[PDB]
């Protein structure tokens, strides 16, 4: 049936019997979640007018859905503006409890077109499932910059095999794209502003320490921490395979253009790359881009052995500091 929901209450008590869901202005009662978890297969879903949520610490996830075949969309002018600033105490998962915006977990053979969200107070899009597509996805963060906003990571993928995020435009203050696991996931057009880049890790020490074919291109990175980054853990185990950055252009870059490092400890690089964690077939191609004076251009430093095949070309970061630090990377490349 064709439904109508004024409120999320409403929404996840008849979702079921629903061909076709429209979210017309829902404000989600405090430390809820806008739940369309469990969705009937095929069933489209419509963001209309303004979705809001109440305040609350809390660990959201402030909507998170689920079901096969489903087509979420927003309609002309819709919003979904979380008003993280709530939230936002410059300690991201430290300080306030915030909640995460969105669990995509199980939302599989579905996609998701369009929406505009607007300041998530922490983490925008969890994404466990299979075959899913975020298609001209607009994550506006930016008053994040100045208001406190971290560890606002755009995608956060694990556990997840066919994973699309195309024209995604990005304005957060971590990772525009983060991949902790997953397979066969595509990164294409995006604009990646204020965030930590385009990132495959910090991969270990998980359930799944697998990232197999990962393709991150036609991206631009602007005011970022990092650009092109592959974080591996220090002592862990796992798979990093088949990664390609492809026509990212970068600029306004703080720490590193290109950041491949195998010595992740308690979330901080110690020097010391180890090499349980293989990183093959690594490609980049047409990286290229202006650092800041204090960042370093490009930073490679492999554990003994685990990093092989590679392909390097086009690889051309300016203004920074040029590491003499790399080390175990295969020769095409070069700091
Ligand atoms: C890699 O992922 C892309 C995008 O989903 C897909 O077209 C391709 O078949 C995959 N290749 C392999 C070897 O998994
Ligand atoms: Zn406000
Ligand atoms: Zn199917
Ligand atoms: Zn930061």
Redesign the pocket.
Known sequence: DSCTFTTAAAAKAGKAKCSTITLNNIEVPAGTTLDLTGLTSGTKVIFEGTTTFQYEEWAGPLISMSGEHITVTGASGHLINCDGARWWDGKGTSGKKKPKFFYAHGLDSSSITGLNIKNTPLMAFSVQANDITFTDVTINNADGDTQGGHNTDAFDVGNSV?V?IIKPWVHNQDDCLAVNSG????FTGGTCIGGHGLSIGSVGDRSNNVV??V?IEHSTVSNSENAVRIKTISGATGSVS?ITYSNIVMSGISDYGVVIQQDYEDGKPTGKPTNGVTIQDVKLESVTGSVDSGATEIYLLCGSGSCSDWTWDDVKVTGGKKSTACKNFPSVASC
Not at 183 to 186: A, Q, S, V, Y
């Open positions: 066919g699309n397979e066969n996931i595509w197999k074919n393709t088949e």
